[PDB]
Design an enzyme around this catalytic site. Structure first.
Site, mmCIF file in Angstrom:
data_model
loop_
_atom_site.group_PDB
_atom_site.id
_atom_site.type_symbol
_atom_site.label_atom_id
_atom_site.label_comp_id
_atom_site.label_asym_id
_atom_site.label_seq_id
_atom_site.Cartn_x
_atom_site.Cartn_y
_atom_site.Cartn_z
ATOM 1 N N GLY A 25 0.795 -1.244 0.000
ATOM 2 C CA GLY A 25 0.000 0.000 0.000
ATOM 3 C C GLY A 25 0.822 1.287 0.000
ATOM 4 O O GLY A 25 0.573 2.206 -0.797
ATOM 5 N N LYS A 37 1.807 -17.454 -9.744
ATOM 6 C CA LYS A 37 2.405 -16.892 -8.557
ATOM 7 C C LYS A 37 2.078 -17.752 -7.356
ATOM 8 O O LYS A 37 2.929 -17.968 -6.499
ATOM 9 C CB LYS A 37 1.890 -15.464 -8.388
ATOM 10 C CG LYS A 37 2.482 -14.706 -7.226
ATOM 11 C CD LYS A 37 1.903 -13.274 -7.134
ATOM 12 C CE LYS A 37 2.597 -12.215 -8.025
ATOM 13 N NZ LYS A 37 3.838 -11.705 -7.353
ATOM 14 N N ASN A 63 7.507 -21.350 -0.103
ATOM 15 C CA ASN A 63 7.284 -20.573 1.098
ATOM 16 C C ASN A 63 7.302 -21.319 2.422
ATOM 17 O O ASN A 63 7.931 -20.853 3.371
ATOM 18 C CB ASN A 63 5.990 -19.724 0.973
ATOM 19 C CG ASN A 63 6.133 -18.528 0.041
ATOM 20 O OD1 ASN A 63 6.946 -18.512 -0.880
ATOM 21 N ND2 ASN A 63 5.302 -17.512 0.283
ATOM 22 N N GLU A 65 0.003 -16.277 5.566
ATOM 23 C CA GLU A 65 -1.042 -16.435 4.601
ATOM 24 C C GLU A 65 -1.112 -17.908 4.141
ATOM 25 O O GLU A 65 -1.645 -18.160 3.083
ATOM 26 C CB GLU A 65 -0.784 -15.509 3.389
ATOM 27 C CG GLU A 65 -1.238 -14.002 3.493
ATOM 28 C CD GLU A 65 -0.926 -13.199 2.165
ATOM 29 O OE1 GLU A 65 0.278 -13.090 1.813
ATOM 30 O OE2 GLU A 65 -1.866 -12.686 1.475
HETATM 31 N N1 LIG Z 1 5.526 -7.294 0.423
HETATM 32 C C1 LIG Z 1 5.724 -7.595 -0.851
HETATM 33 O O1 LIG Z 1 6.911 -7.156 -1.466
HETATM 34 C C2 LIG Z 1 4.689 -8.343 -1.659
HETATM 35 C C3 LIG Z 1 3.387 -8.518 -1.176
HETATM 36 N N2 LIG Z 1 2.402 -9.080 -1.957
HETATM 37 C C4 LIG Z 1 1.017 -9.222 -1.446
HETATM 38 O O2 LIG Z 1 0.375 -7.956 -1.260
HETATM 39 C C5 LIG Z 1 -0.458 -8.067 -0.100
HETATM 40 C C6 LIG Z 1 -0.004 -7.123 1.021
HETATM 41 O O3 LIG Z 1 1.333 -7.370 1.388
HETATM 42 P P1 LIG Z 1 2.177 -6.469 2.416
HETATM 43 O O4 LIG Z 1 1.965 -5.050 2.055
HETATM 44 O O5 LIG Z 1 3.560 -6.995 2.498
HETATM 45 O O6 LIG Z 1 1.502 -6.818 3.821
HETATM 46 P P2 LIG Z 1 1.541 -5.811 5.076
HETATM 47 O O7 LIG Z 1 1.110 -6.544 6.284
HETATM 48 O O8 LIG Z 1 2.907 -5.229 5.248
HETATM 49 O O9 LIG Z 1 0.436 -4.666 4.714
HETATM 50 C C7 LIG Z 1 -0.934 -4.718 5.088
HETATM 51 C C8 LIG Z 1 -1.286 -3.746 6.222
HETATM 52 O O10 LIG Z 1 -2.701 -3.605 6.297
HETATM 53 C C9 LIG Z 1 -3.081 -3.537 7.649
HETATM 54 N N3 LIG Z 1 -4.521 -3.803 7.906
HETATM 55 C C10 LIG Z 1 -5.214 -4.990 7.896
HETATM 56 N N4 LIG Z 1 -6.508 -4.743 8.222
HETATM 57 C C11 LIG Z 1 -6.650 -3.415 8.446
HETATM 58 C C12 LIG Z 1 -7.728 -2.615 8.810
HETATM 59 N N5 LIG Z 1 -8.971 -3.091 8.771
HETATM 60 N N6 LIG Z 1 -7.537 -1.257 8.977
HETATM 61 C C13 LIG Z 1 -6.299 -0.685 8.789
HETATM 62 N N7 LIG Z 1 -5.235 -1.476 8.428
HETATM 63 C C14 LIG Z 1 -5.406 -2.817 8.257
HETATM 64 C C15 LIG Z 1 -2.132 -4.515 8.324
HETATM 65 O O11 LIG Z 1 -2.090 -4.392 9.733
HETATM 66 P P3 LIG Z 1 -1.276 -5.461 10.618
HETATM 67 O O12 LIG Z 1 0.179 -5.085 10.465
HETATM 68 O O13 LIG Z 1 -1.690 -5.513 12.075
HETATM 69 O O14 LIG Z 1 -1.621 -6.819 10.030
HETATM 70 C C16 LIG Z 1 -0.831 -4.204 7.607
HETATM 71 O O15 LIG Z 1 -0.082 -3.193 8.240
HETATM 72 C C17 LIG Z 1 -0.423 -9.519 0.389
HETATM 73 O O16 LIG Z 1 -1.478 -10.311 -0.139
HETATM 74 C C18 LIG Z 1 0.951 -9.963 -0.096
HETATM 75 O O17 LIG Z 1 1.162 -11.373 -0.115
HETATM 76 C C19 LIG Z 1 2.576 -9.317 -3.295
HETATM 77 C C20 LIG Z 1 3.795 -9.047 -3.912
HETATM 78 C C21 LIG Z 1 4.937 -8.440 -3.152
#
Ligand SMILES: NC(=O)C1=CN([C@@H]2O[C@H](COP(=O)(O)OP(=O)(O)OC[C@H]3O[C@@H](n4cnc5c(N)ncnc54)[C@H](OP(=O)(O)O)[C@@H]3O)[C@@H](O)[C@H]2O)C=CC1
Ligand SMILES: NC(=O)C1=CN([C@@H]2O[C@H](COP(=O)(O)OP(=O)(O)OC[C@H]3O[C@@H](n4cnc5c(N)ncnc54)[C@H](OP(=O)(O)O)[C@@H]3O)[C@@H](O)[C@H]2O)C=CC1
Lengths: 298, 299
Positions: free
Chosen positions: A12, A178, A186, A260
């Protein structure tokens, strides 16, 4: 064009932060830890090219999605339903929700809960939360999205901000490719706490990955998925291009966080069982990660 | 009669200790850690019925088997070949070698290397090395042996020392039953460091065990093994009779020692592959225990 990022974490913040740098109106719905740092000194966006502090709005209230024309939904698969239901009341009726997540069930899950247009995206990027309000981009950061009503306008807007995009009529296939990659590496990496290059040299490991992969290909065939032509070779070659890399699941278990796994090997298990396809190698990897996760929890 | 215990660890010290306690001339070929403890205060033989210091001879020279009429070979499967070749020149020609080990290849391995009569035994006991020179018997301690030239005389000598023995024409099936039990629990317990009663509650674990066992039963059928009738149920019940027990494989990994995994799930893999029978669950369990072992050794 107002943009909201639901679940401002590694993914994000990168994409959200890149859009903010391009001049859009962006608000990151993040956890208190990060909201507190973003409001204090802005979002620190550390890329392989540049390093800056970006002024973006941030909030922990899921209602801050209010008025956004485009919502990038970037939570982990485990939180898809809870996060979507949290934001559903404030979501604009004409909003386009993009699922920037891994897994094969997110878009479907979102469409079962929301009347708004949903489009799956395949995320190609390496990013982490280096600390509070701080995102670190190690590489890539492009997208493949399903066709949306916005058309080429959506891709033009991302390219203009420093994130290339390609529309595809087979995002299903890219998401499954993927998934199978993740099924191959993993859990093995997470259970042994070893990187991919060390893993593939253990006795029997190449044959375990064969077994895991053949189970996944059998499920993908029964599910009518058209995968890329050299998918098996591409999977095997990851151990060579990312030799010192450990998996996200491995990093989750090292930190006492929930993985996950239910959406990786667990998906193959659930699906194989439903289709009459044996999934024993996948089932052992799923059960083992969950046992370790449950010990850590209790 | 003169008796040598080759690989005086948990099993070797118990069985050898009962014989030495009953008045036989027993020599324990143990590691130095233990040899110095025995040469100092004697073998400590603690059962849930008694606790005693037993004067027994002990040595680290495998040539100490010299002049023994009976050799109880009690090393882990990993060491059968090295230990057998260590004692080979010294071993009396009329000596009877009993394999008190787990696995299904030990007696065959011993017969491939030695000319002496070898008999497979199935060991039913719970024993640990509580410390240097100290054996703690937690329960049971009986043997089922293949027929020998020594006949009923062998079983009558063991019974006299408080060790119940039966002779069976199907030691093969008994050894395989124990193997399949170990294939079902050992690796799972070791990879996760959890006892049997915790393990079986995990999501999907009953179904993994089913998969592992079915692979084992397929291999066992193709090998013409006759297993006990309720073997599957007896294996599932272990989780309820030993709920707080972790496996020998778990304890080996906890201590940074090499397990017997190549002779548990690894045997099923190697045999299944050779017979065209899929062994995927077993293969994952074997690979993972091996990866963890390899890390603990070098990196
Ligand atoms: N990281 C990477 O380089 C890669 C990631 N992905 C995919 O992208 C997706 C996200 O990954 P990533 O960004 O690493 O994960 P993260 O955990 O770092 O990001 C998600 C964030 O959303 C928060 N969140 C969940 N529910 C809420 C809520 N209702 N209100 C506010 N915040 C909330 C989480 O909180 P909290 O920390 O408590 O859980 C967390 O901080 C996944 O499906 C992942 O597998 C795909 C390719 C690359
Ligand atoms: N313990 C139990 O309750 C039972 C065990 N079994 C089976 O019985 C067998 C024996 O197990 P256990 O007694 O527990 O194992 P142990 O490791 O306790 O005993 C073996 C001993 O022999 C030693 N040894 C190995 N090679 C030599 C050698 N070259 N010269 C002298 N000593 C040597 C070992 O040394 P080192 O320590 O260096 O390895 C060890 O001290 C196994 O196959 C096991 O699976 C079956 C049922 C129950």
């Amino acid at each position: 064009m107002k943009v909201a990022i639901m679940g401002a974490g590694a993914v994000g913040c990168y994409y959200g932060g890149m859009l903010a740098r391009a001049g859009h109106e962006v608000i990151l719905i993040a956890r208190p830890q990060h909201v507190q740092a973003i409001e204090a000194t802005g979002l620190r966006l550390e890329t392989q090219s540049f390093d800056e502090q970006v002024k973006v709005s941030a909030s922990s209230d899921p209602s801050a999605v209010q008025g956004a024309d485009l919502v990038l939904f970037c939570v982990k698969s485990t939180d898809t339903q809870s996060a979507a239901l949290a934001m559903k009341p404030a979501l604009a009726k004409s909003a386009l929700v993009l699922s920037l997540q891994n897994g094969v069930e997110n878009a479907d899950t979102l469409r079962s809960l929301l009347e708004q247009e949903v489009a799956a995206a395949v995320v190609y990027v390496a990013t982490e939360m280096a600390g509070p309000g701080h995102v670190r981009h190690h590489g890539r950061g492009e997208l493949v999205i399903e066709p949306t009503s916005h058309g080429a306008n959506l891709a033009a807007i991302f390219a203009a901000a420093g994130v290339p995009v390609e529309t595809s009529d087979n995002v299903r296939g890219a998401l499954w490719a993927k998934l199978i990659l993740n099924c191959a590496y993993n859990a093995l990496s997470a259970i042994t706490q070893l990187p991919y290059g060390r893993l593939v040299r253990g006795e029997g490991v190449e044959a375990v990955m064969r077994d895991v992969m053949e189970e996944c290909f059998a499920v993908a065939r029964a599910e009518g998925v058209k995968l890329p032509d050299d998918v098996a070779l591409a999977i095997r070659r990851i151990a060579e291009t990312m030799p010192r890399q450990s998996s996200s699941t491995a990093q989750d278990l090292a930190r006492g966080k929930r993985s996950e796994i239910d959406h990786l090997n667990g998906l193959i298990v659930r699906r194989g069982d439903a289709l009459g396809i044996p999934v024993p190698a996948n089932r052992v990897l799923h059960a083992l990660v969950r046992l370790i996760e449950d010990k850590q929890q209790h």
